[PDB]
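Assemble and predict.
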Amino acid sequence: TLEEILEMMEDEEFTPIIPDAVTDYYLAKNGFETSDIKIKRILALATQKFISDIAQDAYEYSRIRSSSSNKVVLTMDDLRSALGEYGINVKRPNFY
Amino acid sequence: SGIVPTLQNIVATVTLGCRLDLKTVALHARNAEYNPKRFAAVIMRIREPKTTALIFASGKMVVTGAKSEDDSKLASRKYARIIQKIGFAAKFTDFKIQNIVGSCDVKFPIRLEGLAFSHGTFSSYEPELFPGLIYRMVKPKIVLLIFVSGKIVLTGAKQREEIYQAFEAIYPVLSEFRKM
Amino acid sequence: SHTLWSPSDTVKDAAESLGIFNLNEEAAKNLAMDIEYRIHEILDQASKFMRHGKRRTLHTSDIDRALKVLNLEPLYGYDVSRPLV
Amino acid sequence: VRLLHLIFATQNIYSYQDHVPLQLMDFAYRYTTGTLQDATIYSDHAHASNAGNAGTNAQLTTEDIRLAIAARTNYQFKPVPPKELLLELAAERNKKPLPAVIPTWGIRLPPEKYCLTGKDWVL
Amino acid sequence: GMNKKFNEIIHLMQQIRRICFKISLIRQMQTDKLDSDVSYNSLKRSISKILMANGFESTAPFCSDVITQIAENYFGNLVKTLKNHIESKSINKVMGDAKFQKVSNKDILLLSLLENGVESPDALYEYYNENIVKQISKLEGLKSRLSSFLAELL
Amino acid sequence: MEIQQMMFVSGETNDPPVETTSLIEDIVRSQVVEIVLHSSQTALSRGTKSIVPEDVIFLIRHDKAKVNRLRTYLSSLKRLKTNDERTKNMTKEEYVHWSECRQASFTFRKAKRFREWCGLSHLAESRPSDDVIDILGFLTFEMVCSITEEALIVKMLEERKHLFDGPDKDVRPITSGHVLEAWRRLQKRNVEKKAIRNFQGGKLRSRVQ
Amino acid sequence: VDKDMLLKVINIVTEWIFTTKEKAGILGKMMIFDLELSKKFNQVIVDIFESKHTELTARMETAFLFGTRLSDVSIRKKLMSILSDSLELDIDKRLFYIIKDQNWEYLSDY
Amino acid sequence: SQPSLKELLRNVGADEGDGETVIDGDVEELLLDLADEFVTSVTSFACRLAKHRKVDNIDMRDVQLHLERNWNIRVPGYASDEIRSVRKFQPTAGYNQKVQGVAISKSVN
Amino acid sequence: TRESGKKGMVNSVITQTRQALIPKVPVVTRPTNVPGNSVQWAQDVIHGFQALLASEIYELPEMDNLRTRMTGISREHGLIGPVDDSVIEIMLIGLEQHLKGIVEAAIDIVKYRRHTLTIEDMYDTLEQYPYLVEPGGTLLRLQSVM
């Protein structure tokens, strides 16, 4: 539902990977102070989820690359494709 | 008054517990399709009981086509001769049934629409995915294809009695949705 | 040629990296012209942001903002640490 | 690139951080790729593509590049100072009078319900 | 830190099972006020702790900087949304003279979530259970591979 | 698009004039050519000319996967159950017509003309298989069913003695504007979780379904 | 083709009325056969109006209006009597009927 | 000849069913102005792109392309113009030679 | 040297403005033959600039107004030949799609799940999503109507 979701963030049973201090810094940067702890953990959580989504995009787009049916590296082609499929813009690096 | 399912095909797998030199036995048998680059096993056959047989070098064989548990077993014994007389330890053993398919005709069109959307728990109709309307029984594990003409296909039974069992339980349902 | 940024190889490298063959020379001259102007453009904007931070050694934040104000896409992945080779 | 330092020399900025040349060169590469890509599309457009009607042969004159750039600057690249627009727009604002009032030696705030009351945010 | 603890359990199981995968390949083929830089690098730590998929910081560094900056932008976009709704200066928002908030303090939050990314609340409940199920799913997949390889090596 | 008109009937509704069907034909053709463009590009970037099923199912990469898998293997839910339960009926071959649309898709046999009417000059050095032809049949059928759903939804959201020459058997539900609004709606941009770059400038992206 | 094959097709079309759009195109092209066998053909279009309204009048109303035109007295008396009872007996509602309703198909000489 | 306002009101009555009635003098004027700007910009770029075709003639099918390209508006209708090119990323030998050269510089030498 | 070896490429501001403000006229030469079979006119440009364009009236323009405005722009840019009555309709189509997108955005702002919308909500959503509208002309005008 929704009210369970702020029943749960308060206690230690669900404490986002993003530490409280770092999110406090980024709240403060973009201009928000409040003496609640829920909301900050919540924005932490949503960001965690969004990065998880690009993670799975990268995983699958790496899994297509060869042999469908010296370890794994998430390179610039994998990233070029997933970031592109979002709205993140074109990565056209170069040399010379 | 009797309407009862007929057996259309029994796929059995039996193992002639012994190694088999597939090239050799294909040679002798002569009219056995043995071919390179693909499927490494010899495909035997017989006029009657008209059954096809995939013999594997792993001593195991899969005989198909029999319309009855006894005929299969019989065709399963014929094959351990054509590959025994050719000096081999063709020991017929561990005969198993892999699947039994039946068919039946109730002779009255069926109101599948009504069956499906009162039995959606088991019944299934996606037009692009497949033609016709299905039904998945939980006990016994059988998948029945029911068509409007009233012809049904019973699949997945590992034993004969489950075909009769499956039809004996779905018949009253089909009579309820008999289009008149 | 016309200006800096020799289009005989630079613009040639670009287009032949794309997968074309027929870029007339004068076209690549004009292209060098345009990209050099865009350089001076972004550079002055990041200078405007430089002399509000009242510093001199222009950092990357200056040009990043200077992109963000030109309604132009940002550019990620350039950290001060781990220097260049 | 050393020539990028040479170009920096034109604006009296000899205090770089050495990441800038990499970055701006990467940028120009990206930009010109997009540019001479959509210009190639327009060169195809003059060559009358669909699901098989004719071939695709490249010339890429300057006019196509001009087209591909004008579309970009249609939504980018801070243009010439739009003075006249601003003058007339500001005359439209610079039209209605001042309040001509006296708050009598303090500060006059907006009314509460437009003020913020920066309390600890709470549900 | 139960979320941190479970992501760490994912990390440990990944380490051990990927190690076992690699040696099995080898045997087969044998035959407080805080500042900017600390914040950045803490976020990089947390990021590379997300990445159960590939390998924890097992990619080029440019990509790590990329990801850091992107998530920074996203978090900033969150807060720029909520604070914009809160200032509002519009009749739809703004405490009414008769204390009538057309939309109370919570719909603000739900709404700012909605504008950026997340659609509904319970998608978070969903992603959470999805995570913990990903743990046991990949666990059991590679554990069955482990048992079958223990059978195969014999 | 006789098959599309049959497929449009299969979804729910009847009586499209030639206009909506030719329009839908253009729609489906565009969607499908874009799919094959992307899949061929991805394969050749992997370094192979032959078009394959693994790319294409991941090209959809969404709940769009469960239904497609079932279609290959053969070769919310309460609402789709409840509407079908309401449909339950017979006479003038009521249930009979339902089946026609199911087994008259392009993949049924007419694979050749379905391959040729769409784009085929692409990948001249190779040629795809009929498995992907059946796949595309599934995708085209699902797209036609969805479009029709949205058209009906918007249509509903909008809300003497007989002279015996009006037959009282003619209706005019569906037209250009309805389908256009529906196809705007379906291009819901991205889930908007893919357009979160909220404060910026400039944009471009292609899309399917 | 010969009239016997057309009469067998008309007899096959006579059994069909006792898809609906498929029957319309067959009856519609048989109206082009008026340019004898049409006396057998427009015999059918009389009794179609005698049996049934709720039927699709797409093939009916364009053939009813070419039925009064074909210059044979026994069916034009029959067809125009059907239409002239369906209206009211007032001369008002028969005057509004001929202009506000009942669109006149034929641009032609008639 | 032929026997001779409900466009915006229809553009907005079909968006929602809980009122949400906009106000003129503040909101409606904004939207009309946006529409005007849209039409002016689009037809300008279209006429330029028609002159690009080396034929001094009318403008058709350039609007559809300009919409599909710059804005994200596709129209599934009248014109049918797509790219037709995968836009391959390798011309003849020499570029991939540079690729493998910098590749060996990366790996070993 | 100084490049742009042409009759010129001015880089000033005021002449760009003026030359981008007056109406132009597509008048043609005739060395041997300049086909087209329809003489060029600038009566069309005056007629185009004189229309009761949108934002005065309260409704999106019906075909005829839009056609009269276009001929003006085409002659004013240097084309010839009449617009062919299909352009206007596809343009209206794209337009109404645009505006439905914008207002859907504002509705997504105000209410989460009897309300009434204002100007400030539209300024909020054009602060969040500015990729919708091309900058220039109107946004500056939008920050002078609040």
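The CA atoms of residues 12 and 118 of chain E lie 29 Å apart.
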